[PDB]
């Protein structure tokens, strides 16, 4: 257990627990400090830490000590005895809170028992030397006013009050002659400057501070955790493992990069959480090796220590026993000490990954910041930690009794205001970057607001070094994890070995290095004419002395005029916000503009499924103009083209080393050693893949995810500035009114702000999901593949290396050189899949990753789309696409392959995507339009198979071919085995739903089957279990290849590939998504057009057509003529028959050239009666359910309706459309729909039934039924002449 002593500042000096100490940095001169022993080996000195600081620096100035901290200055803190006593009682309370739980008590016990070794690097191996500044510190015994008598004492930790900056707590170690005992295995007296009252503040991005913008946001820290964070550094220093290694250094070559001190891995380990992931496995092992090496030195010393010359009274055995337990060394029955690898591993991991701020916060239910790399806010002052109504030892601020245990409400600034006070900004100093334009307007930007981007030098290149493989050689993995539960329940973690007495000989050698600190300018002026995130956010603010503003979409005007504020919301939102109205209409207006704000913010949930993008926040570019000029042009378009990369302010140069070669050790005659060597080389190869992935994650987290964090914060600020601007306008407009008018204006300012905040929170959630998806996207598509390339290259080089090794050792292996030759082939075959959870256990990160992987659209490894008269891959993996001259492209994403040699597309796929191995798992989807057979060429049509898409590599791969009315999918494994699955449509149907008409194809492959889906429906299945390895990432050639007629061609659209098997459900959805359009289609599936001749088809009367009756103004319905020749293979009904209709637009006298017909458009349905253009009419006064349509010349009669509204009542994909007659555009008076009706005719000579072109009200209710009745007589399709259909 740990005992926390009690005492008051004014208690008498007793030379035991209350002394006059000579601090280490005093060099044995100057005054002494009244120090109090709060626990064994731990002292508290309630005074300011002045070592290395100028007295005037305690005053707030125009300078700062740290570039990344909102520094609070207060020279009077601790300037009175009573203040000193309050500090003591507070420290006592924090220590009690700390030991209030096993984990904290153990942290304290480890620290108390982790006494520094008696000596350092300069001390001979055979000696203990207590006469050094890192081991002994002096206390003055003699009477006041005379240093005549002093005594020495051993100590582990001395905690002082704060230095100039109150909120800048720090743990300092003792360096002597340029070296640090605490960094070389020995350990040394540790010091700390700490302040319990002025604590840090933080707010989570992915969260919300009570979801109240207009209110105080963020959470304040629990000083006990802040203290335990420093105690962890102390712990590392005491055990001499606070080593220095390759640090994370921020890139600072650009004006938008955040400047900060180099960050050592020990700092990141101390914080825990995701931060250890920023330290590559390479550096993790480097640091581990240095510590182990340090411990080897100490263990050697224990085996050689013979005497303590500095203190004759030191009991050698007592200390050897203590140090043995401190470092967990083992000793044989003779007393010989050695390192036990298992115990060292557990101690090391406990100290580096067990005791972390993150782990401790979780255990104590204390909320803290998500990461070391998170924006720092201004600190707040805790009113009274000594008041149990505000802070207790058991629960800190989160007192369940005050209903503040849940959701850390006790630390919430918006909720627990009685616990703290804001700090006077006058006493705060903040490092700012002044961005001046070459003229000159300047904008100040806090350093914290810039992008933190780790420089390439931050990462180790150890992977490029060679490795010797031997029968010995084993793997090396350091899990940045330690089960906190075993630590808390560990029986031998805490020492039970006697703690040596603290009294010793007074120190006489005061040699020590004393740090010297100095402030630097708080403002750094730079020049740039760029208008990026900082300028854009700035343009959204207004001075405090201005109260009348107006919104504007003009960024430039907003910068120029102080009464102009920039807005990235709609033109309409902006106009309404600037609208001035009468008092009686103000409440109405407030409701309107506020509602508009919510709508605008909610556009953050915009979908873009047709472009294969589920979520897109359209206004991000306009809001920040971050990255590559995202404020210009259409952001959504730019994103579809370049993806996540366009939002990055800077594209990092990644460190991706060529993996070093393996040197296999020769073992002539030894069969086992040789075989073991081979195995060890294989496993070692896996360590390389994993380490490479770890190197990638580290860079992603510190160079890319940091940039996206800045963007998320930027959007939070942007949205808030917008709400604030609207709030400013509303207040102004309201206050222009007189008191009398205001009394009659029904406005609730708190409901308004509530409405706004809610809209903002909803927006922020969408933006968070959007950005995280972008960040993961960049990792998976722009980083991992470049590592895979090097790793694959490594595998190859290693492959020949091993086989050649099994070669030179063929004899010594005998009848086995074959068994292990295949062993090598199959091993270097299956590659390591990337799993983020292996490199971090951070919930937020893991969830981001899993979400990404649960989105089928991220499985797209090829997506050919039209852009600027060219086809390019938008999957994000950068496939090279060569479209040759003979291919015809249009902006409808349709491309045509002809019989010409130059009608071809060459696609070179990305070779670094896990596509192959395990069992063949991928899908291919595309739309296709295949022309009808030439009647006089039916034999060749059904006989000649021709390839259209071929993808082979080493005579293995896949292809899509066509033989007449059959489309074929063929696989060929590495051995030559071939399997096929096909879809064949009928060519004897009166009306085919496939011939020369656009339809959707989807082929999926799993280890068992090959399936072909047509328009979402499964059509064919083939068992492909026998098929082995199938190389599918070779070049893809789009080209008609075979014995084709020179008239043969093929149209294709939306070609894409997925590296997984699509479900029937995914396919049906893709089908509906790619079928969608605002316009109607024609019979062939192309967009319906105005001013284009069309024959009419009726889905309810397939074999019927309309013809103007010779004797009357009606359309009689006749039977379609048919294929007349004698081929047994074909049959169809003629399509180019009946009247030639043409659709004319009703509105805008923009003439009659041509155009796209959209749903709900009002039209005139006309047709050609010889040299005249006639029209389709409906007599206005019929009382029956239906009537024959009236066909006549163009004219305007009050007796006939002439306007038609083209409709689409079907919710599912179809090329049919419906035609409605309404009383007039505005009314909701429906006359009926155009269809076909059967009439009975009985005349003097003929008796029979005849069908006529009609209008019926009966259809009105029918088109509502679900599922949609495709057989309804009101379903029509327009058929224009097409080269793909000849009759
Ligand atoms: Ca690490
Ligand atoms: Ca302005
Ligand atoms: Zn720290």
Coordinates of N, CA, C and O and ligand atoms in Angstrom, one line a residue, residues 538-543 557-566, ligand 2:
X538 N -11.7 33.2 -42.6 CA -11.7 34.6 -42.2 C -12.7 35.5 -42.9 O -13.3 36.3 -42.2
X539 N -13.0 35.2 -44.2 CA -13.9 36.0 -44.9 C -15.4 35.8 -44.4 O -16.3 36.5 -44.8
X540 N -15.5 34.8 -43.5 CA -16.8 34.5 -42.9 C -17.1 35.2 -41.6 O -18.0 34.9 -40.9
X541 N -16.1 36.1 -41.2 CA -16.3 36.8 -39.9 C -16.5 38.3 -40.1 O -16.5 38.8 -41.2
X542 N -16.7 39.0 -39.0 CA -16.9 40.4 -39.1 C -16.5 41.0 -37.8 O -16.5 40.4 -36.7
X543 N -16.0 42.3 -37.8 CA -15.4 43.0 -36.6 C -16.5 43.1 -35.5 O -17.7 43.1 -35.8
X557 N -15.5 40.2 -52.3 CA -16.2 41.3 -51.7 C -16.2 41.2 -50.2 O -16.1 42.2 -49.4
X558 N -16.3 40.0 -49.7 CA -16.4 39.7 -48.2 C -15.0 40.1 -47.6 O -15.0 40.6 -46.5
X559 N -13.9 39.9 -48.3 CA -12.6 40.3 -47.8 C -12.5 41.8 -47.7 O -11.9 42.4 -46.8
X560 N -13.0 42.4 -48.8 CA -12.9 43.9 -48.9 C -13.8 44.7 -48.0 O -13.3 45.7 -47.4
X561 N -15.0 44.3 -47.8 CA -15.9 45.1 -47.0 C -16.2 44.4 -45.6 O -16.6 43.3 -45.6
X562 N -16.1 45.2 -44.6 CA -16.3 44.7 -43.2 C -17.7 44.4 -42.9 O -18.0 43.7 -42.0
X563 N -18.6 45.0 -43.7 CA -20.1 44.7 -43.5 C -20.6 43.6 -44.4 O -21.8 43.3 -44.5
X564 N -19.6 43.0 -45.2 CA -20.0 41.9 -46.1 C -19.4 40.6 -45.5 O -18.2 40.6 -45.1
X565 N -20.2 39.6 -45.4 CA -19.8 38.3 -44.9 C -20.0 37.2 -45.9 O -21.1 37.1 -46.5
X566 N -19.0 36.4 -46.2 CA -19.1 35.4 -47.2 C -19.9 34.2 -46.7 O -19.9 33.8 -45.5
Ligands
LIG2 CA1 -16.0 41.0 -44.7

